[model samples]
Target: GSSGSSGKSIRLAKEKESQADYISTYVEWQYIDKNITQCFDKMTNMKLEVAWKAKKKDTVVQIHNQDFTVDLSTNTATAPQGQTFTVQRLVKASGPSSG
Candidate 1:
């Protein structure tokens, strides 16, 4: 008889969540007439640029998870309206560069 060892077969599948929110990284934006501000709850290494309806003018902003901590990440965007915007966590750091 041939000796054959069978490897462990366990289902390693991620459960899919039922969320309708298309905006992941996109933050809830606060509109003030023509000027708007997007509030975020985390810090990220992602360099963000906000554009108004495909406008060439975009601003770089960073949202820290805490007012004093730097732990950020980015998410896929669905729209440019007031929503939760997640910055890309591409850098390795223990704290925010600012403060």
Candidate 2:
């Protein structure tokens, strides 16, 4: 029994490389709901959705898609669109442990 030169073997084993998850959580108002609060800027990746205007510097922010003004007293995200940026970031789909 004999085997000739292990015929052309090219193996490619790629490990793991995934990107998408950034956090800088701060912006509050306990993440408004029935009103609005869709957060994610990450220094400008855009996906915010805020609503609770008439305060917080007459807020109205949605640069990628807007209503008007923008202020909510310096940013924080983990809620919906919260910026005027003196805060950080957010990302939410699913994950759990405790409060």
Candidate 3:
């Protein structure tokens, strides 16, 4: 039989809101595997020229049976109205077992 192995996957979601004279946006990504799901949340104000900000809650969780690390990556910029932004989340899993 072959030795042990490792892998990862990603999931994303988005939302928007309007407050007074400004519009806001939200984005979220989930780094998932057979035994764990790590999440990253993000938000931005449409009036600012700066990049979007993100948050991560519950850094580690068990999904199938493995352990994984999740984190919010680099900055992601938001666009004007009727436009969308792209954000990245990172997921790293432990390596295979020794034979």
Candidate 4:
């Protein structure tokens, strides 16, 4: 009966979820230490914020627990205190893609 097809789809979805969990666990085990170290090294360093300009209004970007509202019309964003960087960084990080 057609019910068998539905069961197959459900089983496939479950298998996909299990595969994702296994892959994510393996990746975390392999890179968690390096990721933490890199995060520490970049905590005080200038971070990368990607933003798109094709949007019709301001775009909000969250990076490293900080929020950046990109004003595309002005080609600038309000940088936090003690953060020495430019909106150009956002442009560069975003590249030409709107994604």
Candidate 5:
């Protein structure tokens, strides 16, 4: 039975991973006072509004848009500004190898 072809069975399954964090990890956040959930966009030099509750460091803010989730896809998923960017993959770039 020499029917062994190029289609050999190997476990083509995906392996383990350190894993990406929750959606929160996809974007950094700025916690404002519980009374006023306003964030500053220095790039646009404007004040962006958000409603929130203070749960300490893990505080939550309302993005007020349908695209809102554990991710902050900025300017309510339209505009861009300072201190707000959808990125958590801030690795592997920086520092000097000059020794």
Candidate 6:
């Protein structure tokens, strides 16, 4: 799991292993007040995908096909290039552990 501590949550997810299409999702607002926001405190006993992609684009794609990253606090992700993406939030998930 990748995090920026700034407050944003970035996630990438895809379907069909033989695909080049995936979606990127972002959670957390940079402008949001951390003191008042737990970021995902509202989440509770739910399974949500922070991102998604199509099986077609998942085919042999190029490098630029998916060059991006997520910034939580900013609540936004930067896609160097791509046509499709998705974003969502989870509830009652896990913690952000360090290794």
Best by lDDT: 2
Among all candidates shown, the one with the greatest TM-score: 4
Q: TM-scores across all candidates?
A: 0.17, 0.21, 0.20, 0.28, 0.18, 0.21
Model 2 Cα lDDT, one tens digit per residue, 1-99 = 887677356643322111111222323332333346544355333333233221244344444354434344554332254532322234444668677
When superposed on Cα atoms, how far off is each prediction in RMSD? 14.7, 13.7, 21.9, 13.2, 13.4, 18.7
lDDT scores of the candidates, listed in order: 0.31, 0.36, 0.31, 0.35, 0.29, 0.30
Q: Between candidates 1 and 5, which one is better according to TM-score?
A: 5
Candidate numbers sorted by lDDT from highest down: 2, 4, 1, 3, 6, 5
Error at 94, model 4, angstroms:
18
Q: How many clashing residue pairs are found in candidate 3?
A: 5
Q: Return the lDDT, model 6, position 89.
A: 39
Q: Write down the worst ten-residue block by lDDT for model 1.
A: 65-74
lDDT of 5 at 21: 24
Q: Which parts of model 4 are misplaced by more than 4 Å?
A: 1-53, 79-85, 89-99
- Model 1 misses residue 59 by how many Å? 25
Q: For model 6, how many clashes? A: 17
Residue-level error in angstroms, candidate 1, position 1: 15
